Amino acid sequence: PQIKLVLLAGVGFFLDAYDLFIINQVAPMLAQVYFPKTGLPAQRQDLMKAAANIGCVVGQVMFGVLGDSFGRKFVYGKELILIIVATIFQMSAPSHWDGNRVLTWITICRVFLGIGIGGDYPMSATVVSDRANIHRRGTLLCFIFANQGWGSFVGSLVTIVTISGFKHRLKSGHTHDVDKAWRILIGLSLIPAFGTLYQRLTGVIASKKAHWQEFVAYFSTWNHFRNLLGSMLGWFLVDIAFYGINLNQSVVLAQIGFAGKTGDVYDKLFQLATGNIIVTALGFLPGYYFTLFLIDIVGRKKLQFMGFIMSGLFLAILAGEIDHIGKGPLLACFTFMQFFFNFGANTTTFIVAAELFPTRIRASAHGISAAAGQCGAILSSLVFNQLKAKIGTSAVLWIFFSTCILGFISTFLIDETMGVDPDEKDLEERRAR
Numbered sequence: 001p002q003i004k005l006v007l008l009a010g011v012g013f014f015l016d017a018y019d020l021f022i023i024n025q026v027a028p029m030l031a032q033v034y035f036p037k038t039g040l041p042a043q044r045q046d047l048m049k050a051a052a053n054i055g056c057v058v059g060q061v062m063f064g065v066l067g068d069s070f071g072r073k074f075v076y077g078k079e080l081i082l083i084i085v086a087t088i089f090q091m092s093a094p095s096h097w098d099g100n101r102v103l104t105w106i107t108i109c110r111v112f113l114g115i116g117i118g119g120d121y122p123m124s125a126t127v128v129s130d131r132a133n134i135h136r137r138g139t140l141l142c143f144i145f146a147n148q149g150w151g152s153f154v155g156s157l158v159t160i161v162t163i164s165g166f167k168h169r170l171k172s173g174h175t176h177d178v179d180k181a182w183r184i185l186i187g188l189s190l191i192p193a194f195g196t197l198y199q200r201l202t203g204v205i206a207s208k209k210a211h212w213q214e215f216v217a218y219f220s221t222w223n224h225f226r227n228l229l230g231s232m233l234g235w236f237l238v239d240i241a242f243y244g245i246n247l248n249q250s251v252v253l254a255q256i257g258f259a260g261k262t263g264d265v266y267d268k269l270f271q272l273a274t275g276n277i278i279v280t281a282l283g284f285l286p287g288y289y290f291t292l293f294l295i296d297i298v299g300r301k302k303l304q305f306m307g308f309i310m311s312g313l314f315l316a317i318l319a320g321e322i323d324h325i326g327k328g329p330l331l332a333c334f335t336f337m338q339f340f341f342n343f344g345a346n347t348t349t350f351i352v353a354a355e356l357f358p359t360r361i362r363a364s365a366h367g368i369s370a371a372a373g374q375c376g377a378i379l380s381s382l383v384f385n386q387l388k389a390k391i392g393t394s395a396v397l398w399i400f401f402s403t404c405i406l407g408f409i410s411t412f413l414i415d416e417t418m419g420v421d422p423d424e425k426d427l428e429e430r431r432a433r
């Protein structure tokens with residue numbers, strides 16, 4: 001039936017999400033092995049974490065050219081093998097290498113990893129927005145998008161299980177086995193990857209200038225231009241804080257009381273992994289499902305309004321009080337923020353970008369909107385840890401705060417897509433004129 005296809009897209013989203021966010025759990029282990037006395041260099045850590053998002057836009061543009069040039073049967077399988085190979089090379093960095101060399105190994109591997117993740121990422125949204133043509137199209141988009149929380153959650157769940165497995169061996173003095181652990185965290189993504197592989201198995205310039213002429217003609221009108229504008233900004237703006245935080249969630253929990261002064265090698269890693277599962281289970285994951293139950297009742301905008309404006313509130317409380325109040329109050333607000341990321345802008349911007357546009361231009365407008373989002377992701381990802389040392393963490397959170405207010409303001413540019421058919425709206429727009 002039609003069901004088996006959306007699950008395959010879901011596990012595609014899950015694997016992308018797992019592979020994307022698992023770098024947040026892997027980074028602290030690399031520190032203990034190759035840089036035990038000093039932290040990971042700021043510039044090198046930023047490059048490593050942005051690498052996946054950098055490839056993510058390269059993927060959907062390259063797999064866009066190749067997919068438009070030679071069809072869909074030329075990209076469907078090849079996207080999955082690229083992230084599999086990138087996982088293996090990343091997994092098998094020579095353990096006898098220098099710290100900087102190991103880092104440079106992993107950064108490069110994750111770029112190719114991003115290129116594959118970029119393929120099935122916008123392609124999983126169109127298959128179910130074009131197919132449904134029903135009021136319950138948003139809940140379908142949200143369900144596949146909800147796998148992003150499971151990717152972050154399962155990665156967090158995998159981490160505590162892995163760390164607790166090395167407990168006795170670490171306590172008995174075998175401290176280098178953490179070098180084995182971080183390879184296991186990355187490798188475990190291979191299990192659904194191979195399973196999906198089997199199930200997936202078992203006049204070009206004249207047309208590009210004609211669709212460009214229609215695209216330019218369409219988005220040269222205000223009521224049509226602004227819909228692409230708000231779609232581009234909202235996805236761009238939410239991804240700044242969203243990926244800057246979620247790819248650095250372990251860094252924030254280090255300013256909070258989860259990075260102490262007590263404990264040995266195991267005690268340190270386990271307390272940090274404890275906070276990560278708390279936040280992603282209590283906040284990050286359920287946010288997708290609150291969005292799931294209310295988009296076709298409340299509307300995309302009101303949820304986007306709330307999502308942008310609520311997560312901002314908790315960002316200001318952090319920035320003002322992070323250096324002044326205790327761990328408890330800070331942790332609670334951090335979880336609330338993560339909750340309203342997925343219960344709000346992060347999920348709706350993905351939905352709104354696929355729901356706003358008539359099909360005749362939707363591929364570009366969603367592609368540009370998704371590309372716009374990844375642009376915000378790479379911005380924060382590339383500079384997050386560098387700013388943290390130059391201006392301080394409180395100052396950086398004030399920046400993420402400002403991006404949320406602008407997202408709230410920009411959301412006014414969007415038409416509410418709940419229950420509206422963008423193709424029927426375009427047809428009625430034309431028949432009246």
Ligand SMILES: CCCCCCCCCO[C@@H]1O[C@H](CO)[C@@H](O)[C@H](O)[C@H]1O
Nearest residue numbers: 085086089090101104105108109110112
């Ligand atoms: C599909 C996955 C592709 C994996 C690519 C692995 C690239 C490994 C890079 O090695 C390192 O490159 C640095 C400069 O390039 C050198 O400073 C260093 O001496 C060298 O060890």
Ligand SMILES: CCCCCCCCCO[C@@H]1O[C@H](CO)[C@@H](O)[C@H](O)[C@H]1O
Nearest residue numbers: 223226301409410411412413414415416
């Ligand atoms: C510096 C100037 C900035 C101008 C930004 C103003 C955005 C105006 C958007 O209004 C839109 O008008 C439509 C009706 O025409 C409504 O259907 C739609 O809901 C609403 O979003």
